[PDB]
Write an enzyme that holds these catalytic residues in place. Structure first.
Site, PDB file in Angstrom:
ATOM      1  N   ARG A  38       0.827  -1.198   0.000  1.00 34.32           N
ATOM      2  CA  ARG A  38       0.000   0.000   0.000  1.00 34.32           C
ATOM      3  C   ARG A  38       0.869   1.258   0.000  1.00 34.32           C
ATOM      4  NH1 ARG A  38      -4.533  -2.437   4.313  1.00 34.32           N
ATOM      5  NH2 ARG A  38      -6.317  -2.311   2.892  1.00 34.32           N
ATOM      6  N   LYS A 215     -23.914 -15.749   2.648  1.00 33.97           N
ATOM      7  CA  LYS A 215     -25.348 -15.523   2.764  1.00 33.97           C
ATOM      8  C   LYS A 215     -25.892 -14.872   1.496  1.00 33.97           C
ATOM      9  CE  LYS A 215     -23.658 -14.086   7.237  1.00 33.97           C
ATOM     10  NZ  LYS A 215     -24.140 -14.902   8.356  1.00 33.97           N
ATOM     11  N   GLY A 396     -14.369  -2.694   1.235  1.00 41.90           N
ATOM     12  CA  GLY A 396     -15.580  -1.994   1.631  1.00 41.90           C
ATOM     13  C   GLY A 396     -16.027  -0.992   0.568  1.00 41.90           C
TER      14      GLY A 396
END
Length: 416
Positions: A38, A215, A396
């Site tokens: 990074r 899920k 995210g």
């Protein structure tokens, strides 16, 4: 929009102080960097500013989650200042705070080409807007202080650059709070925007989404948004069992089953058919007698069912062939989620074979976009970060994008 954003290539930084938000949330151990990827990723942007005669480059970032508590013993950015010094081959000043008169005056007029790294932003509760107090009780930043905190950051430079795509899904002070004339995306941000905008607005077709996950219920918006855009969709991983139970009467043993998800499976398939979206579910599986790396393994098909006391933890060879068929048809792929428990060698053949297919696809001109998180982790695992078109730097962030949500950090950027 993801296009029509100001980026660093078009930003004039001649004699300008550049305040740059970067991704320095590196993994560490014994107060040392265990992976500086990074840090290296942000170098092209920093170089560019200095090489085009920037007065200064003021770097701000976060590390871990101190939660608005100054923790320079634990979550200091000082190790990064050292590594950055080496990588640049140039000296780097490390301030022990990111705001305040001291920091301000220090950033007011540095010598030509000064690299200044500020301390972890999340030492202040004002960065995130919420956090914890000294004692470990949850607290919320005061609006006056947030404004004060943001005012300070704004002084530290003349122009702003956001190269922290991985935090752009959050309305943090360093994302949306830098009040300056010009607010541009860095070269990392650029790539994210360039790949995702083309993919979501004007894709080369067929466009295949590969969705993997545990899920169903928590991916309704992701699935829906992709069904509005794609030509094909692989639904892989545990969540596939919910579809197979509902659709094909499958016995799934102890496999993951999403009761809430199951209720909208047929709604999803209906939407898919109406949009002309070919769905590929798995047809076979590597089973396990318990959720464990060293479980007993077996096989099953939809038809054979999975026995009681066995769960499916990977797709089988026939599934991998079906996955490959769809990948071979794709001119564009967005892959968000592994199709098995890739961290366990016994259940990683499905994800690895798919990774081989996506790499092969790339080599013959397929545009392949990997979401951050597990999927990106699989590219690092198997040394294919350079074998696919784009590995998103923010898990995210990329999810939110693919879900069609607002990215405050992107919205705060100037337009062109």
């Amino acid at each position: 929009s993801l296009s029509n954003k100001l980026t660093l290539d078009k930003l004039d930084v001649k004699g300008k102080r550049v305040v740059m938000r970067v991704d320095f949330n590196v993994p560490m151990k014994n107060n040392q960097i265990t992976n500086n990827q990074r840090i290296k990723a942000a170098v092209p942007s920093i170089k560019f500013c200095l090489d085009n005669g920037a007065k200064s480059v003021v770097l701000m970032s976060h590390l871990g989650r101190p939660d608005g508590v100054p923790m320079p013993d634990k979550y200091s950015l000082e190790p990064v200042a050292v590594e950055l010094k080496s990588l640049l081959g140039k000296d780097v000043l490390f301030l022990k705070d990111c705001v305040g008169p001291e920091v301000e005056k220090a950033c007011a007029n540095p010598a030509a080409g000064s690299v200044i790294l500020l301390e972890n932003l999340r030492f202040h509760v004002e960065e995130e807007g919420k956090g914890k107090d000294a004692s470990g009780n949850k607290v919320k930043a005061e609006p006056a202080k947030i404004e004060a905190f943001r005012a300070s950051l704004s002084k530290l430079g003349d122009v702003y650059v956001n190269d922290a795509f991985g935090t752009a899904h959050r309305a943090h002070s360093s994302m949306v709070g830098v009040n300056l004339p010009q607010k541009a995306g860095g070269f990392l941000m650029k790539k994210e925007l360039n790949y995702f905008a083309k993919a979501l607005e004007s894709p080369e077709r067929p466009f295949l989404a590969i969705l993997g996950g545990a899920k169903v219920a928590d991916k309704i918006q992701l699935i829906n948004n992709m069904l509005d855009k794609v030509n094909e969709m692989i639904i892989g991983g545990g969540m596939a069992f919910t579809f197979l139970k509902v659709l094909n009467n499958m016995e799934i043993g102890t496999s993951l089953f999403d009761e809430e998800g199951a209720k909208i499976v047929k709604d999803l398939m209906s939407k898919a058919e109406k949009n002309g979206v070919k769905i590929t579910l798995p047809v076979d599986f590597v089973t396990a007698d318990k959720f464990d790396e060293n479980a007993k393994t077996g096989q099953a098909t939809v038809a054979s069912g999975i026995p009681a006391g066995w769960m499916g933890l990977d797709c089988g060879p026939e599934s991998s062939k079906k996955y490959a068929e769809a990948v071979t048809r794709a001119k564009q792929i967005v892959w968000n989620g592994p199709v098995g428990v890739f961290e366990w060698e016994a259940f990683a053949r499905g994800t690895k074979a798919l990774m081989d297919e996506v790499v092969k696809a790339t080599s013959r001109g397929c545009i392949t976009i990997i979401g951050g998180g597990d999927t990106a982790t699989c590219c690092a695992k198997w040394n294919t970060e350079d074998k696919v078109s784009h590995v998103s730097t923010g898990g995210g962030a990329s999810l939110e994008l693919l879900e069609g949500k607002v990215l405050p950090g992107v919205d705060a950027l100037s337009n062109i």
